[PDB]
Symmetry: C3
Subunit: 30 residues, 3 copies
């Protein structure tokens, strides 16, 4: 129903996925 709210949530989900990738690179020492 509230698509703008949904995009805010979607952006947060994608932020968490990018953060997990950044952290993975750090943790695996690339």
């Amino acid at each position: 129903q509230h698509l703008l709210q949904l995009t805010v949530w979607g952006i947060k989900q994608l932020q968490a996925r990018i953060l997990a990738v950044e952290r993975y690179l750090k943790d695996q020492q690339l």
Copy 2:
């Protein structure tokens, strides 16, 4: 014209780019 529609599409495009990175890490065995 419909900027909220455009942000939905943009989020989908970024999702595909993050997915490609996740898959690359897996495929290259990091």
Copy 3:
């Protein structure tokens, strides 16, 4: 105040973070 404007900016910020990851993979030769 203008949440749709804010999501456009947020998407741009996430795009820059994904781009930095893509470039990192290239530069580190994975």
